Amino acid sequence: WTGQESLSDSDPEMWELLQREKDRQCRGLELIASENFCSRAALEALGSCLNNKYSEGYPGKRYYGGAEVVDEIELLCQRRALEAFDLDPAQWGVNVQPYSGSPANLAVYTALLQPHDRIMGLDLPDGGHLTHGYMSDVKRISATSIFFESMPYKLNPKTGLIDYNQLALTARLFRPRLIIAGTSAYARLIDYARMREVCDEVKAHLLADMAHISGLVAAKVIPSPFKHADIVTTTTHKTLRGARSGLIFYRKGVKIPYTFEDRINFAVFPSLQGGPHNHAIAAVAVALKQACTPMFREYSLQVLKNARAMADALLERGYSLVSGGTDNHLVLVDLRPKGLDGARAERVLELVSITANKNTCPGDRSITPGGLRLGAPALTSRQFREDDFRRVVDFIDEGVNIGLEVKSKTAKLQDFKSFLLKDSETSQRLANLRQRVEQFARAFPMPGFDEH
Amino acid sequence: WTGQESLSDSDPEMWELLQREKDRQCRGLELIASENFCSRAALEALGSCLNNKYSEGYPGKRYYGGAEVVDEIELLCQRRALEAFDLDPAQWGVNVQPYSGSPANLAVYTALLQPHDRIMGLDLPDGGHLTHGYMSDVKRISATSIFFESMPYKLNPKTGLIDYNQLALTARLFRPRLIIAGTSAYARLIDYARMREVCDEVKAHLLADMAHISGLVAAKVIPSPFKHADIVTTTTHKTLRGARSGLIFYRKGVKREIPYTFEDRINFAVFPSLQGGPHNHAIAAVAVALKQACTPMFREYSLQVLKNARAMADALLERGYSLVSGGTDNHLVLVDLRPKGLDGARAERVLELVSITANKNTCPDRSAITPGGLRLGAPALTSRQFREDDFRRVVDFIDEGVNIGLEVKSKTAKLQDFKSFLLKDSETSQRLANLRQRVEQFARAFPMPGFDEH
Amino acid sequence: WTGQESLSDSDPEMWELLQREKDRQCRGLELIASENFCSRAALEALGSCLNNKYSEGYPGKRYYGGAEVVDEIELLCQRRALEAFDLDPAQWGVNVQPYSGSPANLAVYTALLQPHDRIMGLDLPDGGHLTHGYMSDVKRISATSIFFESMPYKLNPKTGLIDYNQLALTARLFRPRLIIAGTSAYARLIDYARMREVCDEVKAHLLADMAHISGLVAAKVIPSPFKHADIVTTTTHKTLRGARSGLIFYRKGVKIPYTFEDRINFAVFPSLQGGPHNHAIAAVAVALKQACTPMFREYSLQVLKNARAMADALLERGYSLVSGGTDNHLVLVDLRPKGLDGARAERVLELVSITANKNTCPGDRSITPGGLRLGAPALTSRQFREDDFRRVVDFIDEGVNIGLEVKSKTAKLQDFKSFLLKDSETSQRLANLRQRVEQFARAFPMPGFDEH
Amino acid sequence: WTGQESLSDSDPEMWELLQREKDRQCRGLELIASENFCSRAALEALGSCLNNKYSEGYPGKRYYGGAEVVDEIELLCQRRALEAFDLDPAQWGVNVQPYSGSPANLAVYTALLQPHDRIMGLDLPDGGHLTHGYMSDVKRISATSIFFESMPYKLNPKTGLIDYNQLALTARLFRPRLIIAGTSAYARLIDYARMREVCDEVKAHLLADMAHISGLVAAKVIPSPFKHADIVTTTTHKTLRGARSGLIFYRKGVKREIPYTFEDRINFAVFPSLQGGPHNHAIAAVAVALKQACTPMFREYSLQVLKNARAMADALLERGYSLVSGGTDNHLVLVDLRPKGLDGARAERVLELVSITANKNTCPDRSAITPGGLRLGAPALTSRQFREDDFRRVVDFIDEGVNIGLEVKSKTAKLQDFKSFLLKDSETSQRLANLRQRVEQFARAFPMPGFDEH
Ligand SMILES: Nc1nc2ccn(CCCc3ccc(C(=O)N[C@@H](CCC(=O)O)C(=O)O)c(F)c3)c2c(=O)[nH]1
Ligand SMILES: Nc1nc2ccn(CCCc3ccc(C(=O)N[C@@H](CCC(=O)O)C(=O)O)c(F)c3)c2c(=O)[nH]1
Ligand SMILES: *Cc1c(COP(=O)(O)O)cnc(C)c1O
Ligand SMILES: *Cc1c(COP(=O)(O)O)cnc(C)c1O
Ligand SMILES: *Cc1c(COP(=O)(O)O)cnc(C)c1O
Ligand SMILES: *Cc1c(COP(=O)(O)O)cnc(C)c1O
């Protein structure tokens, strides 16, 4: 045994599963707003010998020795991170060791807050993320709601926009130590200047969680939260199109000096994490280099055009969009007017190789959602353009109409799901649409390796 | 732009760094006990298209669709995990989504404990890990000590072994809800039976953190913690020789029929409580390594790890070196350098300059910035087909670096003067260059798992 | 030494101080809304041999023996407590061991909540009490804000009333485990039914802290919070006219059964307190017996008439009242229109033997307050009637006019305070008013002993 | 209605209860170590018009006006407190507003600690108080254990004394921020010097809870905790023979000039953090009792308390009774009844039925519902002019009740059968009535501090 045998020869069962997933991605219309297709260059670093290096600590401050190369790799990733977002190294530092987006947020809370200190994020059914402090009326769900005390702020259901006025009102009463400006299902630009004013009034840190829009921020196609935020967290995948990892940007210099650097770094290690994933760090550095190129600005501009073309196409077919439209990479469809819910439509679309996720509309109470979240980054990476996304909406409309007919023939949601598989005419009607969807999607190029 | 260009074509700066690190790993004598060299098969899965799939939730209960293949991969990783450690699926479950070893431990505490509940683990200078509850005398270090109340149990300074009697005494007073039986720097086997007895008396959970010895447990070359522990966490790298990830094993079934209530709490703590989207590429790489851990090849590898560790221990004893707890019974050796005139901080930088990677280790000592001895591991070089004689020559190379450090200590004052002379003195740098020359020449001859150039 | 010597002979220095304070109470116009004059009957029990009995535990469940009499005294106090507020013993229990009003509230929180569980009370400058969870923008002040997580609710500054709508809005976001319906400076009746609806919606306990209005509740001159609250706390002094102690009323029976009794009792002892103060318990029982008499209903009715007469008199002199008037025992005067603040007026009134306390008006930001809280219970106990309180307002008006003239001759507040003592003409003008105030007050009877 | 009618005229039911309790106190032999009989001078201040004054805040910094007289009373109580324990006002301050002993302790924890900070006190069955951090094995009992993390230190079961060595060992591991040197059932003197050394090593606050021995410390008949402790809490009753209230003494001044930071934190925790309006009537009654504690009369009283406690201990030893820790050095005796055939639960109910009030006490035992022996105190009866011979007759009365209980145990099964036969058996109830007859006849002859009929 040498450890140099290929996966194809060593583990054929796992190699086959890799090919099955690769085929599923190539043949499907990927519309999950948080999904992207990572480049082969980054994947080559993700699966590299850098997995074999324990480098606990930070460049120059390592527990072990023999870290001279991974120090260069981590320092280069930091430089490329600051360059990708046009940041002055005298004003901004960055930690590239968070294992993912969720560990990045937990590191910020651990760094800047005491246990049970107060946090305000956008409510989960309103578009906020778990790590912004979600707990139901029955249970603390996110650990951010366990180790810290969270209170959400809400959208204005009439406009579908963040209610910045109610946030200001409630933050004055709740007195949060940190407020999160960042979303998972929000089609509009965040008023970071207004978030900053609220934070300054109540003496709270402003954290910008730009995970969904980080690639758009780097390409300078939407306003940057770095002009207003004290801390900026993000995933390294999603619109950044990198390997799965996290980043913590923090201000340094004159605030009285900023005191984020040492607290943020200490929270990541040794407080929360162990050995860094240097293979992910390198793959992140490869992606950040790509994010600085004119290619990536063209890609991010096309992401905006494709999302607007998808929004326009849906509006012409008689669909309603939460907040009327979109200013970023995703679209929030409200399907309740058309007579279908997000749970039924998401299941029908999934069976025809169209991946979307149901989304709560401002009307419901988190109640099967009557909405759908659609994203452009993944297919735009496959060189989809405006006309291609209009064709995507055509396929979506067929799936919705199939779900409408099954709804008239079924009662509960489980009867709906079972009817899509047991009924013969519905089965073949879905099979025909699935086949037409996959031939269309297979023709587009796919980033990454050929077989896996 | 297609995203299919090679890394060497599209980013030569990063490709050069990848090759330099690969050349550093190939030419060096890796002796860090927590290090290993991942197989190429697992690395091909680690850098795969599985990075492009959000599968929040668990098989059969995802939040998105399109998870049909990653559900098979996650379920296969679970089955391969239960098989690798010879567990009945009716009595044991496993979560394969922890991002690393530290997230695996924090998920267990979040699943089973309320904030500020009490935790007992081996102290960090005594061989424990950070995530077992390490807080100093001026600040709380690990988040284990922030979100929960931790009190350490210590070694017996006369024997170098865990003081199970003092642990039993202090556990009756501290009343912990969870005790961690797991180590980061400990050369002997843990009495999990005595650990279970202490936990059963104070009515605390027994968590086994076998991250350092997971490969040895899977190959059944050392006693398994699963016979006494309710929860077992581990890394997927180190002795398991996989990609960097974590695992949480938990008891299932009957503890009328009073059932175990670990599964739903453990899974919920991992997601949605603590983590976001799983790293499906790591999960597949773990499943590749877990399959290898079931083969007779892996049993022979872990057996060689044990013999190499004892051969390194005996080769050290026969050259005037003291060993904490006398010797070893697992994969590492805790060498005590103070009955030699040198410390762990001085020796590790000398060894690092001759391509020999080790880490300083606190011995059962006086100061802390100059810890006692070193921690040396077997699994890394054993994966490079190292035999007993090969490690005896490694000890030969170590002893030569030890003597160079002892001579530099004679010409230098404090630590900074010691390290500065290693790079500034002409005769010293040339003497280090020669030893590094023969160490690298000796290490390159051995094979290396993974790819060829990266 | 026998321990039977009188205080007059044993400690003349302390006996003189007792007489000095007694004279100060007899000669002063006591307008602090939380003050009353305890009867001699209750004071006789307060300073009795019951101080010499350690009775940790509860009637029948004592740690020690020889508690047969104090068990009868504690059980009688409970029966008189339930009778005073017209409570069915099958529906209500009562703990008579809280050392004061603040220990009573802390016992309820400890009994029903976990550390850092959420609490909503009226903001302190809005009329709420410390023990309802007060913390400034700089510091956790009340231990209720330290061991538990509090968020206040506010008055509507346009009306001076509790903003029940904003409470409902914010309670839905804050998700409190307990909401406090009770005030220290509020001249209106609390909508306990609306508080109950908010609590039922968010699954919170409704605690009614009736300390200021307990005597009014017992006499049935204002609506009772026992019709809507799960728990009711109160002081035993103030409008109840007893010794200083506390009470915790709790529902028992069918809620599914109520589980307040064992948790409340365990929280008082052994969790929080030690040995009960049986001398206070007996003095409380004496007061509760008085609260059941037709005399006490006449007293409480006169308290309402006197407060309304004081409010009407102030309105006729051109004063403004927060919320327009009063429905209970106190009046909230807003002095900012007259050109004087509460801090200046309270100091001038104090020097002429008129005891009031400055009070924040809904306009200020907690800024020397421009308001005054005036209370009727204390002087009503001295047989003050409507015309007597109109004479009190006459004296108050003179003091305000003195403060207005000193304000025109001084700059800072410290210059104002110093001018009232150093300036000769201001000194004698205050001395004349003080003399006229004290002759008027001395003529009225005073509950308690003659000399002390 | 004037509010000036007498209690006997306006509430005869309550007046009768007051007289019955006064008659019970006069006719009984009060042996509870925490009990005492307050002087009439203090009771006249306790039930005074000072109940009618809200004085939230502190002298010179009140929230209301009209506090000119209560400011003098509170300041005089402070001066009398500092004088009673012979403290330099430049080095010690005192808060006289705690409602009782338990509020005084909670105020110190709130002032000096964050929630869930660590606290070490003597375990409750070992002689500690609830407010020192008592939590059982199934639930947290005292709020000390809820809002803060407490770990108990234990007695040496072979000597009955505090195991200062095990306390030093466990304090290095638990790392408490505050250690309480104070007891509720402990017959020996506390080594505050050893307590300060342990606190100085682990860098924890040393709080002395002298509530049981405050009168003995003021009269300088036992060593004072103020020489070693930074904070000292106490009740104002018990040995101090005052009204029920509490005190918090704290170090002031210089610990450049690094000052003590106790005063502002302690005062703020009492008000506005924890308490509302002070009980000015209790504060004045405390000042009356604190003045008495400075007189040579009180020194002779505390000396008699010590001799009466040792006379009661010797009278017990000479009748076949074992004493925890061998004997006593303060005001109480810890009698161990198991080398006699009876338990504390059975003896205390027999003694209670003959007007002899004691309490069961856990001895260094097997069970808990039937604790070992009893706790007997001297200060109560010593205030009734009891001499050494008087307590030797008290032991005579106790021993007679002990023997009646031993005979009832021979005819009964468990505890409920024991207590039921004491009231149901004709010969037993008549034998108890005779002993009660002579106990009450012997106790009534002695004077009683306070009023005559209430
Ligand atoms: N706007 C927005 N859109 C999206 C789309 C994807 N995500 C990321 C995950 C979303 C999420 C996570 C956990 C729960 C959750 O808690 N589920 C169960 C627990 C299971 C159990 O009980 O077994 C519960 O409710 O308890 C949830 F309902 C939803 C987001 C997001 O975060 N925000
Ligand atoms: N409506 C209403 N009216 C009244 C009238 C009397 N009271 C009862 C006490 C009121 C109160 C208590 C504490 C603070 C307070 O915190 N002060 C200082 C601390 C001192 C320091 O710093 O040394 C601070 O602000 O820190 C306060 F400003 C006010 C109330 C009430 O409770 N409510
Ligand atoms: C390695 C190890 C950890 C941490 O693993 P990471 O992958 O670095 O998070 C924790 N505990 C033990 C016992 C370990 O051996
Ligand atoms: C994606 C996302 C996260 C979590 O990222 P993971 O890599 O899944 O941990 C957190 N917050 C926001 C706003 C996100 O978009
Ligand atoms: C008496 C005592 C207490 C409690 O006193 P209370 O007045 O009952 O609150 C606390 N600690 C010690 C050491 C005591 O002796
Ligand atoms: C008076 C009052 C308190 C506190 O009473 P104290 O006896 O001073 O502790 C608490 N809450 C309210 C509403 C009060 O009126």
Catalytic-role residue among C235, C239, C355, C426: C235
Judged by DSSP in three states, B167 sits in helix
Q: How many whole angstroms separate alpha carbon C204 and alpha carbon C348?
A: 44
CA of D25 from ligand 3 middle (Å) equals: 67
User: Looking at the complex, does the CB of residue C133 fall below 8 Å from at least one CB of chain A?
Assistant: no
| Pairing outcome for strands D178-182 and D205-209 | parallel
Burial group, residue C84, by CB count within 10 angstroms (0-12, 13-18, 19+): buried
Q: Within 10 A of D396 (CB to CB), how many other CB atoms are there? A: 12
Strands D178-182 and D118-122: parallel
Tell me which H or E stretch contains A433.
helix A424-442
Residues with Cβ within 8 Å of A405's Cβ and at least 6 positions away in sequence, in order, are A426
Which of B107, B81, B50, B53 lies closest to B282, judged by CA? Answer: B50
Instruction: Please indicate whether residue D308, judged by its CB atom, sits closer than 6 Å to ligand 5.
Output: no
D16 is catalytic: no
Provide φ and ψ at C378, rounded to 5°. -65, -50
Cβ neighbours of residue C422 closer than 8 Å, sequence gap 6 or more: none
Question: Residue type for D299, please?
Answer: R
Chain C closest CA to A118's CA: distance in Å?
Answer: 9
Distance CA D37, CA B132 (A): 54
- Which ligand has the shortest distance to the CA of A122? 1
**Token pair recorded at residue A298:** 């063209």
Task: State which amino acid sits at residue C275.
Answer: G
**Pairing mode, strands B178-182 and B231-235:** unpaired
Q: Which residue of A has its CA nearest to B245?
A: A277
HEC sequence for chain D: CCCCCCHHHHCHHHHHHHHHHHHHHHHCEECCCCCCCCCHHHHHHHCCHHHHCCCCEECCEECCCCCHHHHHHHHHHHHHHHHHCCCCCCCEEEECCCCCHHHHHHHHHHHHCCCCCEEEEECCCCCCCHHHCCECCCCECCHHHHHCEEEEECECCCCCCECHHHHHHHHHHHCCCEEEEECCCCCCCCCHHHHHHHHHHHCCEEEEECCCCHHHHHCCCCCCHHHCCCEEEEECCHHHCCCCCEEEEEECCECCCCECCCHHHHHHHHHHHHCCCCCHHHHHHHHHHHHHHCCHHHHHHHHHHHHHHHHHHHHHHCCCCEECCCCCCCCEEEEECHHHCCCHHHHHHHHHCCCEECEEECCCCCCCCCCCEEEEECHHHHCCCCCHHHHHHHHHHHHHHHHHHHHHHHHCCCHHHHHHHHHHCHHHHHHHHHHHHHHHHHHHCCCCCCCCCC
Q: What backbone torsions phi and psi does residue D71 show, to the nearest 5 degrees?
A: -65, -45
Which residues does chain B have within 8 Å of residue D152's beta carbon, measured at their own beta carbons? 173
| Closest atom of ligand 1 relative to the B64 alpha carbon | 6
- Residue D235 appears among annotated catalytic residues: yes
Tokens 């987006």 correspond to A101
Pocket test for ligand 5, best of D36, D108, D131 (most atoms within 8 A of CB): D131
Given a contact cutoff of 8 angstroms between Cβ atoms, the answer to whether B212 and B33 are in contact is yes
The answer to whether the bond into C270 is cis (omega within 30° of 0) is yes
Chain D nearest-CA residue for B177: D137
CA nearest neighbour of C433 among C382, C387, C394, C378: C394
Rounded to the nearest 5°, which phi and psi values hold at D341? 100, -5
| Both structure tokens of C317 | 């002199």
Give D-chain residues touching B125 at CB under 8 angstroms.
none
Amino acid D314 reads: D
Listing DSSP states for C39-97 in one string gives: -HHHHHHHTSGGGG----EETTEESSS--HHHHHHHHHHHHHHHHHTT--TTTEEEE--
Half-sphere CA count of D29, side-chain side, radius 13 A: 32
Of the listed ligands, the closest to the CA of D180 is 5
**Closest chain C C-alpha to D416 CA, distance in angstroms:** 14
Within 10 A of B350 (CB to CB), how many other CB atoms are there? 28
- Choose the catalytic residue: C27, C35, C44, C54: C54
Q: Which of C129, C128, C117, C134 is nearest to C163 (CA)?
A: C128
Other CB atoms within 10 A of residue A63 CB? 15
Compute the distance between CA of residue B110 and CA of residue A221 in angstroms, rounded to an integer: 40
Distance CA C283, CA C242 (A): 7
Mapping DSSP to helix (H, G, I), strand (E, B) and coil, where does residue C107 land?
Answer: helix
D170 contact residues in B (CB cutoff 8 A): 170, 173
For A39, B30, B239, the CA distances from B230, given in Å and listed in that order, are 42, 34, 22
- Is any atom of ligand 6 closer than 6 Å to the C-beta of C209? yes
Is there a contact between D203 and B137 if contact means CB atoms under 8 Å apart?
A: yes
Long-range contacts of A382-385 (CB under 8 A, 24+ apart): A382/A37, A382/A441, A382/A444, A382/A445, A382/A446, A382/A447, A383/A444, A383/A445, A383/B2, A384/A306, A384/A444, A385/A302, A385/A305, A385/A306
Task: Tell me the Cα Rg of chain A.
Answer: 23
| Residues contacting A193, CB < 8 A, separation 6+ | A228
The H or E element spanning position B58 is strand B57-58
Using alpha carbons only, give the angle B273, B275, B277 rounded to the nearest 5 degrees: 125
**Kind of pairing, strands A354-355 and A330-334?**
unpaired
Task: Provide the residue count of chain B.
Answer: 454
Collapsed DSSP state (helix, strand, coil) of residue A343: helix
Two structure tokens written together for A213: 């829009």
Ligand 4 atom with minimal separation from the A238 CA: 1
**Among C428, C13, C34, C39, which residue's Cα sits nearest to residue C211?**
C34
Nearest to B55 by CA among B92, B20, B94, B96: B96
**Contact yes or no for D276 and C48 at CB 8 A:** no
Residue B376 is given by DSSP the state E
For strands C354-355 and C29-30, give the pairing.
parallel
C-alpha–C-alpha distance, residues D209 and D203, integer Å: 19
Terminal C-alpha separation, chain B: 24
Q: C120 has which bridge partners?
A: C179
Q: Whose CA is nearest to atom 11 of ligand 5?
A: D129
Identify the residue whose C-alpha is closest to ligand 1 atom 19: B272
Q: DSSP letter at A51?
A: G
Domains present along chain A, CATH in parentheses: 46-291 (3.40.640.10), 295-442 (3.90.1150.10)
Question: Is residue D99 annotated as part of the catalytic site, yes or no?
Answer: no
Does B58 qualify as catalytic in the annotation? no
- Cα distance between residue A275 and residue B333, in whole Å: 21
In one-letter notation, the amino acid at residue D351 is L
CB of A386 closer than 8 Å to CB of A306:
yes
The answer to whether residues A274 and A265 touch, using CB atoms and an 8 Å cutoff, is no
Would the CB atoms of D137 and B203 count as touching at under 8 Å?
Answer: yes
Query: Cβ distance D341 to D373 under 8 Å?
Result: no
DSSP letter assigned to residue A92:
E
Which tokens sit at D447? 């004077």
- Half-sphere exposure at residue D434, Cβ-oriented, CA atoms within 13 angstroms: 7
Take atom 4 of ligand 6 and give the residue whose Cα is closest: C101
Neighbour-count burial of B424, counting CB atoms closer than 10 A to its CB (0-12 exposed, 13-18 middle, 19+ buried): exposed
Angle of helix C386-408 relative to helix C424-442, nearest 10 degrees? 170
Q: Which residue of A has its CA nearest to C175?
A: A137
